[PDB]
Design a protein around this ligand. Structure first.
Ligand SMILES: CCCCCCCCCCCCCCCCCC(=O)OC[C@H](COP(=O)([O-])OCC(O)COP(=O)([O-])OC[C@@H](COC(=O)CCCCCCCCCCCCCCCCC)OC(=O)CCCCCCCCCCCCCCCCC)OC(=O)CCCCCCCCCCCCCCCCC
Ligand SMILES: CCCCCCCCCCCCCCCCCC(=O)OC[C@H](COP(=O)([O-])OCC(O)COP(=O)([O-])OC[C@@H](COC(=O)CCCCCCCCCCCCCCCCC)OC(=O)CCCCCCCCCCCCCCCCC)OC(=O)CCCCCCCCCCCCCCCCC
Ligand SMILES: CCCCCCCCCCCCCCCCCC(=O)OC[C@H](COP(=O)(O)OCCN)OC(=O)CCCCCCCCCCCCCCCCC
Ligand SMILES: CCCCCCCCCCCCCCCCCC(=O)OC[C@H](COP(=O)(O)OCCN)OC(=O)CCCCCCCCCCCCCCCCC
Ligand SMILES: CCCCCCCCCCCCCCCCCC(=O)OC[C@H](COP(=O)(O)OCCN)OC(=O)CCCCCCCCCCCCCCCCC
Ligand SMILES: CCCCCCCCCCCCCCCCCC(=O)OC[C@H](COP(=O)(O)OCCN)OC(=O)CCCCCCCCCCCCCCCCC
Ligand SMILES: CCCCCCCCCCCC(=O)OC[C@H](COP(=O)(O)OCC[N+](C)(C)C)OC(=O)CCCCCCCCCCC
Lengths: 105, 161, 183, 78, 506, 192, 49, 95, 80, 141
């Protein structure tokens, strides 16, 4: 059994476990048909693309629009510029809005 | 503003109006450079550098062949085109840049969660070599075989003797 | 490793622009049913300086937390919350003891690591003083498993690789102990 | 990373040699960037037109399916 | 054995001096290498053991009893082809010296045999791409082995460009599948056979269809086979089909698991068009190799119907058909190479120019073969009648077994169309026979001392000098009698094809 | 199918050569002289130049002997491999295999031997080399590593068969045999 | 960090590099997206059970 | 491709037009029309016509033929037998 | 714009321009492999990408030699 | 790892190159301040190619024979071989002896190409002239 889905550090990646449980199910001798392993196939494909999870987020965003809910009042706060991950945004006691250093670690 | 869109807009314009063979060997270099930069800044810096190391050597060999085969044909020839038909073509092309039709896959943003289990932390090239030289060593040895065939093949084609 | 991923900060802001990266916060605390625990507040240099003393003090709890992860069978982060809180408290206990017993020796060692690219080989002298102070006051010995006790690299008399730049504070503090302790 | 260094060189030389071809190409480039930045929705609506005419599941098609399930499920409870 | 002996031959060929005799003797060493390769392969691979399917080299390769039979067939046909370059085809130096003037001829063949035999075994998308390049590159190098020939180089340029486009299509198909599933091993991909896009595998088949000259991509192969030297055209027109069609059968075996009838319809469309082009295309042609190019396109369409149906009756049909068609292909090209000795010599209208690479280039250069050599003319008639499908020759059972599998699967249209295609193509098959024999009586008492064969000297005028060399004559005799008398052993041969399994088991 | 007892699903290179029968050496010689002999036969069947017999040059016979020598070994290697796999009659090889394994077990030594390879590389090496003899006619690949994936259970060496009582081997339990998997991961479950 | 997972611009805008049998199928043929939309719809239909 | 597409009527027709642009005694030119008698060309006028007929058909008269040419029909015969299209680059034919 | 085969106008009118199109087309496959492998954190895809680059460079050399010898055949008189 | 400082440097390099062109463009005196021989476009006697004083045939678009074309072609197979060792360089320890033996096998198969090129003399210069010494002989009677 050759290795598949090898992470960048040589070990199993995020989705290897899903793939491994599919192989074990499909190759088990206790199974009359491949029907038991159908949910395991969807789980592996969901691990890679997250297509159903993205689809759920599509419904939640759309359902919030039709009820007039504010996107900025029900979502999660975010910052787009890395230089402005400031100590005030991070919540430090002596925080400030001055830019952080990202030029050279 | 994603300035790579403008770069490909200029490249597509020059591919429609290119006339001689030197311009084609420049369309190739004008294509690898956007690929190398976008790989460098988004997905893989390792393969951005591998592209530069290998394709440039192929480009110069390609260029030197143009010198030995340039045959006066397309310097004095005429093309018609039309500026309006060029820009209209590029406008219609620019309209549809959605290579995929899964709207949720193209619109919803995702994240990954880091873990500290990988304490032996090395580069992607070390893992690629670790697998290539151990588990897929047959693939490497066939590639070595194909490279040997090219060496014999180039000689039996080009050498008059 | 400088590979761009989707789980941490990337190389530059051109990577963020291409990925349209959003750095997202969550204002919600952990649910009240889960018991609270104070997180470890030490940064990289103090943690690396204290790595082998946290190992020598929390070995039972570190192994038990990791063994919980293996027995969790995928349900890892949920089923080992209680074991994880023990690990955090034990690690904070070591850092607490360092700042009360070996404060100057401890702060000397991780100030050298910050001065020296966080390479253990560059700060042997300050490490030796910290090892001596910790052993006397906390009875903790640094051990590198899998090798004989006399082949441990941090105890090598004449190492091949040595720091190019010398930490002046470590040189001064090493001389003071030489003339006062090993008479 | 070499496009960052070359881009100022190529762009100015492109305008010098072909000022009208460059202005038309650059003008169209900026217009779509204004469509995306200011949410004019022109490119999105063209995309919604292409999916409808080619038989793809559109954004409205997927939302209609949800509304059909929503009405079906509510009556199943009432 | 192949890989090890190739390295020795590569080095040895570059060490010794260049002479026609040494190249000919090096070719005979290549003959011994393939024979030892066959003996070693037979000694270890047996149909009964490989029925289950055995993984090798970290599951990169997968050999079963269906793959194994094709590998032995490839080795056997390659043995027959090397006899052409390892012995005298005509015995006259002006013609035969061409086969001995290139020392890398045997090296390229051994390079390609490795690619031919490994391709049906591929079990991973990464190794599928690597091997299909290895097979393609060797074919390009063989098409250009005669680099001082303008037509040979022009064909290799056409071959390279078209075959690179197909390879990109093949690579693009595998990249799409990897993108969908994140997996590279075929057996792993089979676990997700119901969820990947099955038309991503049709794109993979489309690239394979280009490499076998299927319509609508038939144009380049008809052009290349006619422009290449007859010795080159003999190899490149048959060898790629033995491996690629076997691989197509295995891919179609996996595709049939999900039973996508839309995919079955697209392939049926390509088969239908190829029958029309293969039959009507050859009606108005004057070159024999152009005629045989359409014959190849037609017989591939027949096999692809068996591959498309893909059932228990299809294994027997494909296995038997590919074996008997390879022998007929070998037999016809062997005769065409030999009968250049009966060509008249000038001592003129239309300014017809004949080159040393293809002395027999037009169908009407086969005139009066019934007078010059009756036994060879009959041997050519038997082969052509086999292509027609005249019972009880081998070609009849090939069409009979193909029809059984096709009609068993409900391909009523394609079964009728091929039988109409067979009748249409009979017109240009009969034209060969008309040229060979129909003017026998009105030309029997004529003085023909202007033939190529008459330029040869005589030893003593008291000895008996055979007009055709020993090895090439025995091969033509053996293959012709196998084609003619297959009725004697047909029952035993078809029982053997029953045992060749592709995951049938029970 | 006339199957036999499985000895080793991936025999080591040294074991295959050591277990050569006198006929396997005989076929090795036949391959070595069969290649120059075929060059004489081909000339006898049809002379390369002209119509008279001419002995091929010594340089051709030198390279032919080398080609036959490798071909003779590959044939003999596949002949001996089938006995390990059980495809061919291997009654003699089973008795020899059982004596060698029981002798090594009684010495608390691995029947497979100690390896320079870590657990991954032993597993990887077995994946690459197992069943590779099926393509030995195309390209070579041999098992030259001491891995533990041989397709056999060492418990079958703990039952005395007919003609093995005079060996008097006292076999320890498998957890005391050095360099075996079942006696390697003592302290950590991911380190041997 | 939350980021999009779209293909590079050069892949979906280069005049030549964007053309292939599978890329045209992904862009112009609805056969693939019809099947995958069924999987997403089953998620909401199966909530009630 | 590399073959002539010339007919005897076209070559004669193009020859007459090229000869009409000169100062000839008569504009009625056929195959039998001689250069010295009917058209009235001296040594230099004849060779001006030959080179003019060379440029029109992209052919070059050999020295032996040119010195011995008498009639218009001889030129038409020469062009038909000797005309070849010029070789094109390696890209014009195959592309 | 793709379905009307707009790419056939972007390819130049020399044999070498066809070679460049083939290289660009294959390079599109490798960029797609790198993109998927990086998102999945899968090194098997990157091994595939490396193999594609090496193999694509091999056929570039083999095709060039055929075109090189094709041009030599035309310049065959070589009376010098 | 942070490459924001590297991004600024690459930006500066791109701008710095255009400075040399611009500064030379703004510094040179206008042609009317010089001998005033007009714009460079008209002065064809200056913009013509240099041929050491005497004009020659304009052979810009004629093909140029290249005597080292075979060596240039063989550069690509060897360049790929060198680039194939990069995975081994950074993984030499991990692969151990198994990878080292595979690395040698990779190089041993490619060394046959080196033997082949040496024995065939394929890396020479393809001259079109050959200097051969004829022997003077006398057909005496
Ligand atoms: C061993 C010597 C040998 O190879 O034969 C002498 C052979 C003949 O030399 P020569 O003086 O020109 O002989 C004059 C005749 O042309 C030579 O005519 P010839 O017919 O007598 O020699 C041709 C030779 C055919 O020689 C080969 O096939 C070379 C096999 C290497 C692959 O046929 C044989 O004699 C076969 C037996 C000798 C080769 C045995 C190789 C066993 C595999 C290892 O020399 C070589 O072929 C040298 C090639 C190998 C060079 C070294 C490669 C180094 C690779 C490893 C580097 C790192 C360490
Ligand atoms: C289209 C392209 C296709 C690809 C074509 C390229 C061809 C590639 C296939 C070549 C082989 C593929 C595998 C390559 C990866 C090898 C890496 C590896 O195995 O490293 C582990 C291996 C060490 O790992 P290990 O688990 O400790 O195994 C120890 C012995 O090697 C194993 O135990 P032992 O019982 O063998 O004891 C060793 C000692 C045994 O000597 C004794 O003490 C007497 C015992 C009885 C031996 C008497 C019979 C000897 C036969 C003559 O002497 C030997 O037997 C030397 C072993 C090599 C024999 C000749 C190799 C045949 C090559 C043909 O490294 C090696 O030394 C392997 C042997 C030398 C490398 C062979 C290179 C062949 C080229
Ligand atoms: C440091 C900057 C170097 C480049 C600065 C010069 C800018 C010019 C364009 C650079 C590349 C942009 C895309 C062009 C692709 C090649 C098409 C081409 O033929 O070159 C364009 C150039 C202009 O000639 P033009 O007169 O406008 O058109 C012919 C009219 N009958 O016709 C020419 O033949 C001139 C080409 C000169 C040699 C250029 C070699 C290519 C260098 C590319 C490096 C940058 C990669 C591309 C980045 C931009 C991508 C669009
Ligand atoms: C040299 C000819 C040797 C024939 C050997 C045919 C062969 O490969 O064996 C039969 C094969 C089944 O073999 P299998 O059962 O798997 O292994 C053990 C069998 N001993 O069954 C097969 O799959 C063989 C498939 C190919 C059969 C091709 C038939 C060729 C007909 C004879 C060739 C013409 C001979 C011309 C003589 C010229 C020489 C002078
Ligand atoms: C070991 C490699 C070198 C061994 C070569 C020994 C050999 O081949 O025998 C010498 C013999 C030459 O004899 P010959 O050339 O006829 O007399 C001199 C004429 N001036 O050559 C011959 O006549 C050929 C006799 C058979 C040669 C067998 C050599 C096999 C090479 C080793 C293969 C296994 C490794
Ligand atoms: C072929 C010769 C291989 C035998 C040899 O000389 O070295 C084998 C030797 C293994 O034996 P050992 O030292 O006992 O390993 C300890 C196992 N725990 O130690 C080794 O494995 C050393 C590696 C042998 C590689 C020799 C060079 C390979 C030849 C490449 C061509
Ligand atoms: C480092 C060396 C710095 C000093 C040398 C360059 C002097 C630049 C100013 C200059 O040349 O000033 C003279 C000029 C105009 O006169 P011109 O001769 O046509 O200038 C040529 C300049 N073009 C090329 C732009 C036309 O007047 C000014 O616009 C004053 C500012």
């Amino acid at each position: 059994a050759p290795l598949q889905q090898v992470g960048r550090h040589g070990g199993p990646n995020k989705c290897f476990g899903e793939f491994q449980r599919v192989v074990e199910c499909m190759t088990n001798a206790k199974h009359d048909s491949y029907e038991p392993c159908n949910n395991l196939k969807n789980d592996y494909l969901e691990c890679r693309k997250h297509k159903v999870e993205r689809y759920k987020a599509f419904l939640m965003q759309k359902h919030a629009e039709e009820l007039g809910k504010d996107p900025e009042e029900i979502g999660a706060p975010f910052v787009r510029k890395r230089r402005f991950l400031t100590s005030k945004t991070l919540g430090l006691v002596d925080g400030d809005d001055y830019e952080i250093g990202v030029e050279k670690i | 503003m994603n300035l790579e869109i403008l770069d490909l807009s200029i490249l597509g314009f020059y591919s429609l109006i290119s006339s001689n063979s030197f311009e084609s060997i420049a369309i190739l270099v004008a294509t690898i450079m956007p690929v190398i930069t976008e790989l460098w800044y988004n997905y893989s810096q390792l393969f951005a550098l591998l592209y530069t190391l290998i394709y440039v050597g192929a480009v110069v060999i390609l260029f030197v062949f143009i010198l030995s085969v340039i045959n006066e044909k397309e310097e004095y020839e005429y093309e018609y085109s039309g500026l309006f038909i060029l820009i209209l073509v590029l406008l219609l092309d620019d309209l549809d840049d959605n290579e995929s039709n899964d709207n949720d896959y193209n619109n919803v943003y995702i994240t990954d969660y880091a873990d500290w289990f990988n304490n032996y932390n090395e580069s992607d090239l070390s893992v690629i070599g670790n697998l290539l030289f151990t588990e897929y060593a047959l693939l490497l040895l066939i590639i070595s075989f194909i490279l040997l065939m090219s060496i014999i093949g180039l000689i039996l084609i080009v050498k008059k003797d | 490793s400088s590979t761009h991923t989707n789980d941490s900060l990337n190389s530059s802001n051109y990577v963020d622009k291409l990925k349209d990266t959003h750095f997202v916060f969550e204002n919600d605390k952990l649910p009240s049913e889960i018991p609270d625990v104070e997180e470890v507040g030490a940064t990289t240099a103090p943690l690396l300086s204290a790595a082998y003393f946290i190992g020598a003090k929390c070995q039972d709890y570190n192994d038990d937390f990791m063994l919980c992860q293996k027995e969790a069978k995928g349900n890892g982060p949920i089923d080992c919350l209680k074991e994880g809180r023990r690990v955090t408290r034990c690690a904070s206990g070591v850092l607490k003891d360092l700042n009360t017993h070996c404060s100057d020796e401890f702060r000397l060692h991780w100030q050298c690591l910050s001065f020296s690219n966080l390479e253990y080989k560059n700060c042997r002298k300050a490490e030796s003083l910290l090892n001596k102070c910790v052993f006397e006051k906390m009875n903790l010995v640094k051990k590198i498993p899998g090798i004989p006790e006399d082949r441990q690299i941090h105890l090598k008399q004449n190492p091949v690789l040595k720091p190019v730049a010398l930490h002046q504070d470590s040189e001064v503090a090493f001389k003071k102990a030489q003339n006062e302790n090993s008479i | 990373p070499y496009l960052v260094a070359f881009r100022p060189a190529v762009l100015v030389f492109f305008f010098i040699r072909q000022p009208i071809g460059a202005g038309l190409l650059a003008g169209g480039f900026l217009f779509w960037q204004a469509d995306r930045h200011f949410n004019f929705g022109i490119r999105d609506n063209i995309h919604n037109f292409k999916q409808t005419i080619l038989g793809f599941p559109t954004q409205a098609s997927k939302w209609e399916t949800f509304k059909q399930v929503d009405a079906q499920k509510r009556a199943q409870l009432v | 054995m192949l890989f090890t002996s190739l390295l020795l031959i590569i080095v040895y060929g570059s060490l010794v001096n260049k002479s026609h005799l040494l190249t000919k003797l090096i070719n005979r060493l290549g003959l011994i290498i393939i024979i030892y390769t066959l003996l070693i392969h037979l000694n270890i691979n047996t149909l009964e053991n490989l029925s289950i399917g055995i993984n090798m080299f970290n599951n990169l390769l997968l050999i079963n009893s269906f793959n194994n039979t094709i590998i032995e067939l490839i080795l056997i046909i390659c043995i027959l082809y090397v006899l052409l370059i390892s012995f005298n085809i005509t015995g006259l130096s002006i013609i035969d010296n061409l086969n001995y003037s290139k020392r890398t001829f045997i090296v390229i063949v051994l390079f390609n045999i490795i690619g031919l035999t490994l391709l049906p075994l591929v079990n991973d998308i990464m190794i599928l791409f690597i091997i299909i390049e290895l097979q393609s590159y060797s074919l390009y190098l063989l098409t250009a082995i005669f680099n001082e020939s303008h037509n040979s180089t022009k064909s290799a340029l056409y071959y390279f460009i078209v075959g690179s486009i197909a390879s990109f299509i093949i690579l693009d198909a595998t990249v799409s599948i990897y993108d969908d599933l994140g997996l590279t091993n075929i057996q792993y991909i089979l676990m997700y056979i119901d969820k990947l896009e099955i038309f991503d595998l049709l794109c993979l088949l489309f690239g394979l269809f280009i490499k076998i000259g299927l319509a609508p991509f038939y144009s380049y192969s008809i052009t290349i086979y006619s422009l290449s030297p007859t010795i080159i055209t003999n190899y490149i027109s048959l060898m790629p089909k033995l491996s690629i069609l076997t691989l197509i059968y295995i891919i179609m075996h996996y595709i049939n698991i999900v039973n996508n009838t839309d995919l079955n319809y697209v392939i049926s469309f390509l088969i239908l068009i190829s029958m029309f082009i293969g039959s009507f295309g050859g009606l108005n042609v004057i070159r024999i190799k152009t005629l045989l190019a359409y014959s190849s396109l037609l017989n591939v369409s027949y096999m692809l119907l068996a591959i498309l149906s893909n059932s228990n009756e299809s294994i027997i049909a494909y296995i038997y058909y590919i074996i008997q068609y390879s022998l007929t292909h070998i037999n016809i090209f062997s005769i065409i190479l030999v009968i250049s000795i009966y060509l008249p010599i000038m001592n003129n209208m239309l300014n017809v120019m004949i080159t040393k690479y293809s002395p027999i280039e037009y169908i009407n250069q086969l005139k009066n073969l019934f007078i010059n050599n009756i036994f060879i003319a009959i041997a050519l008639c038997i082969s052509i009648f086999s292509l027609i499908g005249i019972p009880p020759l081998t070609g009849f059972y090939g069409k009979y077994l193909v029809l059984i599998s096709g009609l068993n699967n409900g391909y009523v249209l394609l079964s009728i169309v091929l039988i109409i295609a067979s009748s249409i193509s009979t017109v240009y098959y009969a034209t060969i026979l008309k040229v060979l024999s129909f003017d026998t009586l009105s030309f029997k008492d004529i003085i023909s001392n202007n033939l190529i064969i008459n330029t040869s000297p005589e030893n003593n005028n008291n000895e008996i000098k055979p007009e055709i060399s020993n090895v090439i004559s025995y091969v033509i005799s053996s293959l012709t009698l196998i084609i003619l008398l297959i009725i004697i052993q047909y029952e035993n041969i078809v029982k053997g094809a029953y045992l060749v399994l592709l995951y049938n088991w029970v | 199918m006339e199957t036999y007892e499985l000895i080793d699903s991936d025999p080591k290179f040294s074991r295959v050569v050591r277990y050569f029968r006198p006929s396997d050496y005989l076929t090795w010689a036949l391959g070595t002289i069969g290649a120059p002999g075929l060059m004489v036969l081909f000339e006898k069947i049809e002379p390369a130049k002209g119509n008279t017999f001419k002995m091929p040059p010594p340089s051709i016979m030198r390279i032919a002997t080398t080609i036959g020598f490798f071909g003779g070994f590959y044939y003999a290697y596949t002949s001996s491999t089938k006995r390990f796999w059980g495809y061919s009659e291997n009654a003699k090889e089973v008795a020899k295999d059982r004596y060698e394994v029981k002798k090594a077990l009684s010495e608390k030594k691995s029947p497979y031997g100690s390896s320079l390879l870590n657990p991954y590389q032993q597993d990887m090496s077995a994946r690459n080399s197992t069943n590779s003899q099926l393509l030995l006619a195309i390209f070579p690949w041999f098992n030259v590593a001491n891995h533990q994936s041989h397709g056999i259970d060492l418990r079958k060496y703990y039952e005395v068969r007919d003609g093995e009582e005079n060996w008097n081997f006292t076999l320890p339990p498998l957890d005391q045999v050095k360099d075996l998997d079942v006696a390697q991961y003592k302290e950590y479950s991911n380190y041997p | 960090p939350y980021s999009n997972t779209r293909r590079p611009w050069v892949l979906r805008r280069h005049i030549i590099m964007k053309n292939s049998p599978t890329k045209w199928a992904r862009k112009y043929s609805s056969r693939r997206d019809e099947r995958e939309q069924e999987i997403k719809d089953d998620y909401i239909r199966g909530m009630g059970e | 491709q590399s073959a002539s597409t010339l007919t005897k009527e076209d070559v004669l027709t193009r020859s007459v037009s090229v000869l009409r642009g000169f100062e000839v005694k008569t504009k009625d030119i056929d195959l039998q029309t001689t250069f010295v008698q009917d058209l009235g060309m001296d040594s230099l006028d004849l060779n001006d016509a030959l080179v003019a007929l060379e440029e029109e058909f992209d052919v070059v008269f050999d020295d032996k033929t040119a010195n011995e040419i008498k009639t218009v029909g001889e030129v038409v015969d020469f062009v038909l037998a000797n005309y070849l299209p010029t070789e094109q680059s390696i890209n014009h034919t195959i592309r | 714009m793709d379905l009307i085969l707009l790419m056939l106008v972007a390819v130049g009118l020399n044999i070498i321009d066809i070679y460049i199109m083939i290289e660009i087309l294959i390079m599109g496959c490798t960029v797609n492999t790198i993109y998927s492998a990086s998102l999945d954190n899968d090194m098997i895809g990157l091994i595939y990408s490396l193999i594609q680059i090496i193999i694509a460079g091999v056929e570039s050399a083999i095709g060039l030699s055929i075109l090189v010898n094709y041009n030599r055949i035309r310049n065959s008189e070589e009376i010098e | 790892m942070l490459q924001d400082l590297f991004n600024n440097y690459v930006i500066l390099v791109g701008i710095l190159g255009l400075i040399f062109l611009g500064v030379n463009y703004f510094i040179v005196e206008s042609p009317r301040m010089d001998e005033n021989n007009g714009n460079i476009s008209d002065y064809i006697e200056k913009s013509g190619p240099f041929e050491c004083g005497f004009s020659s045939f304009e052979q810009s678009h004629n093909p140029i024979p290249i005597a080292f074309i075979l060596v240039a072609l063989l550069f690509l197979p060897f360049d790929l071989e060198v680039s194939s060792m990069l995975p081994y360089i950074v993984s030499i320890y991990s692969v151990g002896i198994y990878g080292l033996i595979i690395f040698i096998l990779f190089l041993l198969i490619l060394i046959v190409g080196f033997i082949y090129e040496f024995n065939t003399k394929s890396l020479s210069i393809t001259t079109i002239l050959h200097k051969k010494n004829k022997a003077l002989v006398k057909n005496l009677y």
